[PDB]
Structure formats: structure tokens, C-alpha cells
A paper describes a structure:
Gorilla bocavirus 1 (GBoV1) is a member of the genus Bocaparvovirus in the Parvoviridae that contain single-stranded DNA (ssDNA) packaging viruses. The structural proteins that form the viral capsid, VP1, VP2 and VP3, are encoded by the cap gene. Sixty copies of VP1, VP2 and VP3 assemble one T = 1 icosahedral capsid in an approximate 1:1:10 ratio in 2-, 3-, 5-related symmetries.
They share the conserved features of the Parvoviridae subfamily, with a channel at the 5-fold symmetry axis, protrusions around the 3-fold axis, the 2/5-fold wall, located between the depressions at the 2- and 5-fold axes and depressions at the 2-fold as well as around the 5-fold axis. In both the GBoV1 structures, excluding residues 1–32, residue 33 to the last C-terminal residue, aa542 (VP3 numbering), were structurally ordered and models could be built into the cryo-reconstructed density maps. The GBoV1 VP3 structure conserved the parvovirus features, including the eight-stranded β-barrel motif, α-helix A and β-strand A. The structure also featured α-helix B, a region unique to the bocaparvoviruses and the ten defined VRs, VR-I to VRVIIIB and VR-IX. The 15C6 epitope lines the 5-fold channel, encompassing the residues that form VR-II (residues 142-GAD-144) and VR-VIIIB (residues 460-STNA-463), which are the DE and HI loops, respectively. The 12C1 epitope sits on the protrusions around the 3-fold axis and contains contact residues from VR-I (80-SNGN-83), VR-IV (276-IRQNGQTTA-284) and VR-VIII (390-NQTT-393).
Author numbering:
A (entry chain A), B (entry chain B): 33 to 542
C (entry chain I): 237 to 440
D (entry chain I): 33 to 134
E (entry chain I): 492 to 542
F (entry chain G): 288 to 338
The structure:
């Protein structure tokens, strides 16, 4: 039946591998609490050491489910088998369920806090599938579902940047701001999730959401040679190379050597030319993408009217550690420990470089723009990467290849928003008084993954991801990677190869 | 199914625009508590500084839903689009739902108060659609549903004026009052909402109410010229003007000038002649509508046996600030801050004046009564106005045009009354003892709005409501109008045009 | 007699919308990021490895294309544009400058914010207008997909990149056309072309 | 019927707004005269102050209708309403008529 | 929140007698031209867009 | 703008005139090398021969 004593779902988990598809199933226990005391608020974060960088933030009384990472949908076993056995994969269909909800009242009698459920209390659930509201999720956020199925998932408050602050900040000689800055505030949108229709559930209820992906494949393959090596060294070429007079060397006309043939295929795009600009508390990137309408007043540097573009490097080989993708494996990691620095996948469509001859030597071209006949592989994503990102709605765009490796889509999976229904309290003083409550429940995500198995005429063995590439750590230093410790600590991958990137194992004939 | 752990509704919100209709959807979380300790009481409010003004008030153990304002049914975005894109609109159908009810018991153990729900407790809901009881709502009350969907709605106690007090007050030389005043008390009606059949709901239940409007349109259009300018200046007129002898000027007979033709259309009605009478604690209006049967004893002035008629001015141009419509934007506003003074809509069917020649000059006619051939536009309502008012049941009436702009109807939307069901407590002393409880729940209002799009042969652009007409305020003074502040404070419109009145944007050929 | 002519358009939309934020602001400031920023040693400042601040997240979306680097070349009676697109086959004799074997490319600026009045779209409203009267200078639409800029850090400050070519992951809005604009233009017949986005706003 | 004293058309004008389409109608009185005395000619414009810039121009005994601007198809009222009420627009079908010739 | 729209209040006044508003005819019959770019009513101004 | 120079919307196609060939003729001599240089490799040569 249905009621308070009947569960609305069950635990779903594991994976199913087939030839043409993989089904991953993940359930988590999540917790949500009241945010902003049921208020919408617009705050200005303006760090003193932020070197003039600022944000406007509308914080909402809402929290949201973020499913975007690979590690949350794949065990390390399943990710290994995925990247070892398949040439490519993409998401096919997502199904998420929120069920087994429990709304407890929080009673503070003192230092001791007690918990008893309000059976008539309720919870708001809203999935935004048309992206009618500012997107909650962003790639590489820590809000994502946990990797370990038995770890609790704590939802993060939803907030959005209503405006670019330095454009709206009403600073300058004139009082009240310039005419252009005021015009940019006079229209600053304000979004409330309460403006949409959505669901209110009690403990005996549940909700489910389906999403259909239509996506480009994630290709797991490596180029064993660059596109320039695709010729045959033994056959001569008809091509002639003329070399102009250089100093005392006479100009010559000769047949190009058989072992260097000319290539038609350029280095992929990328920027090696920029450099990060401290301090670390500002936005530090080799490149800022800025918007600066005419008539605004800017008292800061490029950071703070613009966003840092990172990784700047494309398929180009990073010439410095600043250009490499890097992330901390846990939220408690700081400094040089817990960080994973990306290393080459040893694919020959990656780590490209472009040199121009000055007729003496070749010198590196740092900034490689889009140019015809460019051939490159997209970034070698690992088990920890964002799966997707939100593609901005715009008139025009170039080739969409986010350098972090996430897949940009017009409509990604919609964000499911959840908040505690407000339970007002009588107040003789007309104060705003609500009952303190929280919801815990079980959220499951089933994703169907369309996959393709490789076929190779290669005679020789190929690289595969092996547990022998794992490292040993822990409190007692006996615990291998992706295993729990004596304290229950989950041993994180130390290095980029332990994250099992794609575009490593399976060779590819160009 | 149905029960304590199953929600009886969901959150509905937003708007839907079409050509011939607009659907607005609004849900609020409301709270109600016990009123008058479950008693009916008749109180006499007789302020010492009220300058002899008094009221009889029957206060009831009831609270009521008030949906009458435009701002509660329209976001400022939706109101803008309504008044920019449509020549006229009226309400079509209302649907309200009370659901997701929670009755909590209030436990006071000390300075600390605890809240736990009584699942078998219940709540009375009564909609009066025949207006069999004194109307709860009145235009420009603060009891109305909030503008922000996430703000809690606190219901107000229902009460009504049983009688005009100075007529019933039994004052005079004779003891016990005159014969006429006693006769006016001997019949003073007394109304109990318990006399009607109505619904009692528990948490697992819900109720809904439908109402069908049949209304006059709210016309959003402006006259670019007065009705007197409707002639052609270049064609001569046949009309003759005779001017009698004035002093040493000889009487003349001549053809009226082509650029002044006579008009058939009089100034609309209005009173510029009255003045408010202090102090502010009495009823201060330029005009009192009084009832004074013969045989009553009146020891006071006109105020207190009568009601102030405000705005006194009709379509007539207010000659003083006293004659202008004015309101505070929030309940905490006092004095000169937070008040919005109405300003001209620059429609030429508004701000009318009437002068009579004394044969030397023209002098203003202050009081313009109904006269044949009068042409005027009804008040330019804003997003904050009452939508409707209750029209009194009476034998005879003149043209119904409330000067505040609210639409008078024989039957407006019925008032939904709600109170906490009394939960008596055993008392050995035969005291009246009840259990202290309150109800919070979700109330939704869907209104279908019949609309009409304008068509114009005007070549030139027309005025529209723009966000660039908004102003910037807040604690940090960075927050634009209709946006939330850092504290969560909602920035109120400072001026009358920011309230986006009608009869401004869309020109009209007379 | 009389004649009539019908034509059927198949066209891209003219989009009337504004971005209230740039594509770089699409994150949530309150949630932390996993991303690490390594800053190399600069002078006496030590190299540091730290978590990127929550209020600056890295963006995947580059500034749209444009040229801020060129400048018009007088006199006004020649072809004066920041850029000449020229054709110069081998064997021709050219006794002139770049103007006159080539055509001026104007507006040079893309979605990039014009850094000078030369880069702004400008026209006279009537055929009799001359000089500084009757001219309409384009001003920002206050859309955040317009007026873009690109800076590269030298590890001390950020310096403007004047010429922004096509680069992957670029996001921009097409020019904010007005009631006086060409609706369409003729697209040249050619083998190859890049993204077609005439900077005046006309639809090729 | 048809002849010298029968008009071949009428004045069409205005706009019609709907949800999914807008119809703009514009009629003009046009004038054309003889060009180049009925000759094709190839002229070289080579301004002395043109700083070496020149053009070859084939001028024809022909004139042409140019409909390409937005302001010619939209009144300022209609353009306002277009840009206020709609997120996007594109041309769908054009129909032009030359008639009432003298 | 409300959004920007094109308004006749953004027009300017000019003419021979300087009484004629934009997009209106003058005493001579001269049609008053838009002085500034916003009076030409550009697109990508009024209607906000969620990216 | 003069009637005989109108602004053009159409840019020059792509190309590289900036590079120069690097002798001797027995090596790979081109104005530009497209190279692949993964991190951790050892290169004792110039751009030619890893590209």
C-alpha cells in the first residue's frame, strides 16, 4: 500500500555490462537542511586579498542534486573494465528517484539535540529540465554524489551569479554609478524556484525523473603515431623543396627526402603563451575572458571583470605545470598533498606542438589558434572528471571542445532542486519564525551507457589499466588504492594513471 | 493513497501568456492561530484622540484568505508584460486550493516553546460565496497574499462592524439613550460563521474553491488628446459665437475660430472643493458620507457618524497632494518614507478640469457633479491596487466607478474563512480551557485572465514600462527595485511609475 | 500591365535576447571546486599550489573572435580601414599601397568591445548628412555575449590581446542590429568558408 | 477588365502581428529614368586624392529595386513591438509587385 | 523582475522649431531622424536570456 | 565612406606566410613543424625529427 510505514523504494546498485550498453546503478542516502532561513539573499563577496575580484551571489533556500562526475556512476572496477574493453562510450538514458524520505524535527534543549519526525511535514522537489533558471552545477564542483555508496550525500545550497559585479558595482567619480552601470543593474534578473510548478512530498511519497542523452561519444583510443607519420618512408615523393639562400649557404632545389614527407595536418589549437597572475586568492589564469561594455567604470584589473580560462593549453603539450589539469581528490586536501597532476596519455593526437622555422632553427609557436586541417584528440578524461557541462545559449560558436574534457550540451541533465517546506511558527512579535526540520532520503541514479567494443588487427599486446599500477597508503600504510583503511578512510588515487584515463589503452589506426 | 504521510497537493506557480488569456498561478505557505480564544466579542474602539470617532466591532474566532491585489497574482515581470502587450484585461476564473495542512500543538514549558503535531486535530474552512455574512475584505488592506511566493502568509482575524456606533451609543440627556438609538440597537445583527454548513479538515485532507468572474474590462490605453481636440483645425465651422457687451467692449457676433471648435463632451465628475480635517487619528477626508436618522443623539462632529470619501477627486486633476491616491508599500512604513504618491498617467481622459467664464477670465469649478456628455477614463491602476471591491446591495445607484480604481461587483470572489477547530480541555473549575494549536498549510490561487492585444495604426513608437525606470536601493544601495537585498529585504518600488500603472503605454484613437 | 515576384527565405533566426552574465559566471560561488591552481615562482614570491577560490571558477568558454589591433589609414578619400583584404597574384605590377588592390574590412571588431571610435559601427541617417551631424555611433547593447575582451597574464598583470582569432570553445552573440540595418547580404560562392557572422549584423 | 484606364493594383500597407508570424506590407511610388543613354559603359574611377585606389565600373542602362533594410519594412511602432514582444524573428516569404505603371 | 524595453521616452526632440519628437514630421514636413543608437531600437537589449 | 570603397564583410582565408624552411635539404625542411612531445620523453634533437 502507501503510508508512513511503507517504503517507497529500495536500494539499487551495481553495474551490468553488455556489448552495446552498460547500466550503472547507484543509490545514496542524502541529507538536506534549511538554507538561508527560507530567504533569498543577494550577497557581495569582495575579498580584501582577492585583488579587486568580486561576485554578486543570489543565495536561495534550496539545495540540489549533482550527478556530474564519472566516479560517482562507476566503481573503479567498472571504470577499469569500461576503459579496457571499450573503444568509446556515451550516456544514453538517466533515471533518478528520490524516495524513502524522512523529515525530522530538530529539537535543541541545550547542548543535547534530539530528533523526532514530523509525519505531516513535506519537502519541495523541482527538476529544471528546460534550464529556465541559472544552472546550479558547474564542472569540477565538490557537490557531486559520493563515490562510496555507503557515504552520506550532503546537498549544497543553490546560488547563482545574477550579474557581473564590477559592471554593476556603481563605483566611480559620479555618485550612484555611471549611466551604463546603473542600466546594468536596472536589469539584473532575479530567479525564484517558487515561480515554477513543482512537487511537495511527504514521507510516504516519492518522485522520479528521466532524462535522455543525445551526445557525442567519449572515444577511448590512442594514436600510436601523429598524423604526420602516415606516409611510407620507402616510396619516394614527387614533392620539391626549395630552400632560399641563407647566409653563405646557396639556395637549393631538391626532392624532399622519403623519410620526411610534407604533412597536411596542423597542430590543434591551444595557448602556451599566457601565465597565471597571483595572488592565489584572486582569479589566477593565463587568460581572462572579460566583458567590458563602454561606459562602465573599472577600478580593478582584468581579473574581476572577467573569468579565468583554464586549462589554457589545448591538445598542445603543457610547457609548465601551470598549464596542466590538476585537482584535489578530497575536500580536505590542501597544498601539495592529495593533488593529482595530469600527465601525458602518450596518445599522439595529444601533446602537440607547433614550430616555425626562422631559416636557422625552429622556434615554438606558443599560441595556436584555429587553423584549417587541424587534427587532435579531446582531453583524456579519467574516472574523476565532470561528465558534462552546460553550453551557453548563444548565436554563434566555434568547435565545442572544453579543454577539461567535459561534454558541453545545450541541455544537460536537468538539475533537481530540493528544499525543506517551510513550517511557520506563531509569533506575537511578527518575527519570522519557522520550525527547524531536515530531510534525509534515498536517491538512486540509473544511467544506461551506450558502448562500443574495439576491434584491432594489431598483433602485439596493448596497454591496459592494471591494479599493479595502484599505490599503497593509509594510517598503517598497508592499504592499497581504492580500498578502505583501518579508520574507514578510503584510499584515494595518488597519481593520474591510477585515475585510469581514457585514450591510453586501445591503439587506433589513423 | 490518503493519510498523514501523503501530501494533498503540490506547489503551483508561474504564469502562462497567450493571445486571449493569461493564467497566473501562485502558492503560499500560510499560518493561522486561535483568535479571541474561540469567542465572539463585540468591542467599542473609541480613541481619545480620535476626535469623537468610534466603531463597533464584532471580532470572530476566524481568519480569512484575501486574494485582492494585483501584485499578489502577477510578478513584476508578468505585470510589465501584461501592461505592455495588452490593451485590456479582466479576471475570468479563479481556483483556490487549501492543502498540505499541518496542525501543531503549541507547548509552552517555559521561555522555550515546542511544537508537535496533533494528527487528529482539524481546521474549519468556510467560503462565503453568497455574501450571506459581512464581507471580510476591503480594498487596500494589508491582509492580502504576499507578493513573494516564498514569504509566509499570516491570516488576519475576521471582524465586522455590526452598527454605526454614534447612532447606537445611547448618549444624551435621557438615560439609556433616545427611543431611536435604542431601536437601532434592538436590531443590531449578529453573525456567526458557525451558522453555515462548512468543512472540517485534518492533515490528510484538502479543499478547493472555484469562482467565475463576469466583469468589466480593465482598459490599458491612453488618450493622446482630450475629447475636445477631435476636430480638424483647417476646416471652418458653421457655428456662431455671440459675445455679450463687456464693459467698454462692444457685443460681437462672429464665426467661431477654426482652431477652437465647440465640444460636446464635459469634464468627468469629481470634487476638488473639500479639504481634509485633522487630526490624523480621526477620519480625515475632504468629504464625509454620513447617515443621521431623525431622533438619534449626536455629540460629535460629522466624522464618527460618517465615513470619509477618499480620493475625493474624480478624473479631475488633483489640485493638492491631499487629493492624490497614496499608500505605504510595506506594513512597517511610516511618515514620508515607503509611501507612493500617485502621479499623472498623462492620459487625456484623466486630469480633467472645468472652468466657467465670468466674461473676464475663467475660474475653476471645484465640484463637478454628474452631467450629461461626460467622458473620462477610470483610474490608472498599478500592480499594487485592489482588483475588486464589494458593491453594496441597494435599490438605486449611479454609474459605478470607484475612484481608487478597484472594480465593484455585486458578488466578488467569496471570502474563504478558516479557524482552528476548538480542542476543549477538561476543567474541574468549569473554566473555558482549550488546547493551544495552530495550522500551517499551502494555499494556491490560479486565476485565468482574459486579455486582448492592441492594434495601432500609429507610426511612431509608444511608451512602455522599462526596467530602466527602476531605482536602486538597499542596505548597501546596490540593489535594484523588485530585487532582494543582502539581508533578504525585497526592494520596494519607490515611485508610482515603478508600480507600472495602466493607461500609460498604449495610445488610443478616440 | 503588372508583374509580381515571390521569394522564399530559408534563414537563421535573428535572436533578440541578452545575456545578463558572461559564460564565465555560470558557476555557483558557494560550492567549492576540486580544481587546483599552481602558480609558478614569480620573483621573490614562492611557487604555490592551492585550491582555486570558489568565487573564481575556471571557464571553458573563450572570447569570440575580433581584431582590435588594426587602425584606419587616411586620407578619408582612400579606403580607410584597420584591415585590408587583398588579392595579389604573382606577376601583377602594383605601384600603390595595400588600399586599391584590396578592400577594407570594417567593422574590424568582433563581439570584442571596441577600444576606439574607429571600431564602432557608424552611419549617417540621411543622404544629406555630413560631418558630425546626422551620424549614429553604435553603443553597447549591455548584452554579456557582446563587448568581450581577452587578456593574457604575463605573471605580473594581464595585458589585452588585441587580435582574437577563431579558437575552440568561443561563445558570442551576433551584432545587435537596429531598425536601420541591412537585413541580408550576398554570400560569395566559394569552396571553403569559416563561420559566417558578418560583423555589421547582416545575414549572409 | 484591362487597359489604360484600369489600375493593375492597389495600395497595400501596414502590419499584422500574430504569435508565430508578422506580416509587413509596404507600397511605394517609384520613379525611373533613362541611364547612360541606353549604353553599357566601363569607367575607371581613379581619384587623385584617393591615394592610389581605383575601381573599374561597368555602368548599365538599368535601375534596380533594393528592399534590404529593416526600417523600410517596419514602422518604428512595428519595430518597437517586434523587439519588445519577441525573442527571435526571421524573414519567411517575400512578395513584391510592380504595377500601376506610367 | 522587470526587464528593459524600448520606450518612446527614450526619443529626443528636434526640428526647425525644436518641438518635434523623434520619428515625427516637422513643420516643413521633415521627418525627425533618430539621434542615437538606442532610438534605433537595437535587438539583444530588452529580453533577458538564461545561458 | 567613399562609394568606390565600401566596407567588406569577408576576411582573407587562412594561411602562414611567416615561417621559413630550415636546411639542410637532407633533414625535414618546412616553414612549420607539427610536433608531438609528451612529457617525460628525452629529445636530443631539434624540432625536426620529433615532428
Amino acid at each position: 500500500g502507501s503510508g508512513v510505514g511503507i517504503s517507497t523504494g529500495g536500494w539499487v546498485g551495481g553495474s551490468h555490462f553488455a556489448d552495446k550498453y552498460v547500466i550503472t546503478k547507484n543509490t545514496r542516502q542524502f541529507i538536506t537542511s534549511i538554507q538561508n532561513g527560507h530567504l533569498y539573499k543577494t550577497e557581495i563577496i569582495n575579498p580584501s586579498n582577492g585583488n579587486g575580484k568580486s561576485q554578486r551571489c543570489v543565495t536561495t533556500p534550496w539545495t540540489y542534486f549533482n550527478f556530474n562526475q564519472y566516479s560517482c556512476h562507476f566503481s573503479p572496477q567498472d571504470w577499469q573494465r569500461l576503459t579496457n574493453e571499450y573503444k568509446r562510450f556515451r550516456p544514453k538514458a538517466m533515471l533518478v528517484k528520490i524516495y524513502n524520505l524522512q523529515i525530522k524535527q530538530i529539537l535543541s534543549n541545550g547542548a543535547d539535540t534530539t530528533y523526532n519526525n514530523d509525519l505531516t511535514a513535506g519537502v519541495h522537489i523541482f527538476c529544471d529540465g528546460e534550464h529556465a533558471y541559472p544552472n546550479a552545477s558547474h564542472p569540477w564542483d565538490e557537490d557531486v554524489m559520493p563515490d562510496l555508496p555507503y557515504k552520506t550525500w550532503k546537498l549544497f545550497q543553490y546560488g547563482y551569479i545574477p550579474i557581473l559585479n564590477e559592471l554593476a558595482d556603481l563605483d566611480g567619480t559620479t555618485a550612484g554609478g555611471t549611466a551604463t552601470e546603473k542600466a546594468i543593474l536596472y536589469q539584473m534578473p532575479f530567479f525564484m524556484l517558487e515561480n515554477s510548478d513543482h512537487e511537495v512530498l511527504r514521507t510516504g511519497e516519492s518522485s522520479e525523473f528521466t532524462f535522455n542523452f543525445d551526445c557525442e561519444w567519449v572515444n577511448n583510443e590512442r594514436a600510436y603515431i601523429p598524423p604526420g607519420l602516415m606516409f611510407n618512408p620507402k616510396v619516394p615523393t614527387r614533392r620539391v623543396q626549395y630552400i632560399r639562400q641563407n647566409g653563405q649557404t646557396t639556395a637549393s632545389t631538391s626532392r624532399i627526402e622519403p623519410y620526411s614527407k610534407p604533412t597536411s595536418w596542423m597542430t590543434g589549437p591551444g595557448f602556451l603563451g599566457g601565465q597565471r597572475v597571483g595572488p592565489a586568492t584572486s582569479d589566477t589564469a593565463p587568460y581572462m575572458v572579460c566583458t567590458k561594455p563602454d561606459g562602465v567604470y573599472i577600478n580593478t584589473g582584468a581579473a574581476g571583470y572577467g573569468s579565468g580560462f583554464d586549462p589554457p593549453s589545448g591538445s598542445l603539450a603543457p610547457t609548465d605545470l601551470e598549464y596542466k589539469l590538476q585537482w584535489y581528490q578530497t575536500p580536505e586536501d590542501t597544498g601539495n598533498n592529495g593533488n593529482i597532476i595530469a600527465n601525458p596519455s602518450l596518445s599522439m593526437l595529444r601533446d602537440q606542438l607547433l614550430y616555425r622555422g626562422n631559416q636557422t632553427t625552429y622556434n615554438l609557436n606558443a599560441d595556436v589558434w584555429m587553423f584549417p586541417n587541424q587534427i587532435w584528440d579531446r582531453y583524456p578524461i579519467t574516472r574523476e572528471h565532470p561528465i558534462w557541462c552546460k553550453k551557453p545559449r548563444a548565436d554563434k560558436n566555434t568547435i565545442i571542445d572544453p579543454f577539461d574534457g567535459s561534454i558541453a550540451m545545450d541541455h544537460p541533465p536537468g538539475t533537481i532542486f530540493i528544499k525543506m517546506a517551510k513550517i511557520p511558527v506563531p509569533s506575537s512579535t511578527n518575527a519570522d519564525s519557522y520550525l527547524n526540520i531536515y530531510c534525509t532520503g534515498q536517491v538512486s541514479c540509473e544511467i544506461v551507457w551506450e558502448v562500443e567494443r574495439y576491434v584491432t588487427k594489431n598483433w602485439r599486446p596493448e596497454r591496459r589499466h592494471t591494479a599493479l599500477g595502484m599505490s599503497i597508503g593509509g594510517t598503517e600504510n598497508v592499504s592499497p588504492t581504492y580500498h578502505v583503511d583501518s579508520a574507514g578512510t578510503y584510499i584515494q588515487p595518488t597519481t593520474f594513471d591510477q585515475c585510469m584515463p581514457v585514450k591510453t589503452n586501445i591503439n587506433k589506426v589513423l
